Amino acid sequence: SRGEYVVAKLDDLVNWARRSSLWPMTFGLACCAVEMMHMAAPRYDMDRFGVVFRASPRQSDVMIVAGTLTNKMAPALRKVYDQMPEPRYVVSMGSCANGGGYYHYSYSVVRGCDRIVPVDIYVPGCPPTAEALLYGILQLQRKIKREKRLRIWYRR
């Protein structure tokens, strides 16, 4: 159908635009963030993929939880996630963000950031190498490429 072709092409264009321009929030918590700093270092150069850190949550598209989420911090993380305009994505990095990790059985640690916010990609490691985080980011790009919002709307 003509409308089917039109919505497919529009979905392709929008997905390409969104995945080719990913702006994660300047937001890190612990050791994992250091590896994130090494992903912006010249050797890997995430900016060459169109990935740019931005401090304002209103101007960010992705949240990379790189570190341990404590009970004292969980409201702040949820607050800065809610203030992100949509569409928005979350990447969980390291053991601490994935499931608590080395501090799983602590009284002051959230046993996984997915109890607070939904998570799209889980990057394992303590800490994951900057190459592993880059692989996770590219996997998120592929996941965005698979999105079919306009087709679903048209088929409604």
Ligand X SMILES: CCCCCCCCCCCCCCCCC[C@@H](O)O[C@H](CO[C@H](O)CCCCCCCCCCCCCCC)COP(=O)(O)OCC[N+](C)(C)C
Binding site for ligand X (CB under 6 A): 9, 12-13, 16
131 binds, among ligand SF4, ligand UQ, ligand X, none (CB under 5 to 8 A by kind): none
For residue 123, which of 147, 101, 152 has the smallest C-alpha distance?
101
Rounded to an integer, what distance in angstroms lies between the CA atom of residue 23 and that of residue 59? 8
- 156 assigned to a ligand binding site: yes
Calpha distance 51→60 (Å, rounded): 10
CA distance 5 to 34: 45
Distance separating alpha carbons of residues 39 and 74, to the nearest angstrom = 25
User: Which of ligand X, ligand SF4, ligand DCQ, none binds 138 (CB below 5-8 Å, type-dependent)?
Assistant: none
Residue number, 94 or 136, with CB nearest to ligand SF4: 94
Q: Which residues bind another protein (CB under 8 A)?
A: 13-14, 16-18, 20-21, 41-42, 45, 47-50, 54-59, 61, 73, 75-77, 79-80, 82-87
What residues make contact with ligand UQ under the rule CB under 6 A? 47, 52-53
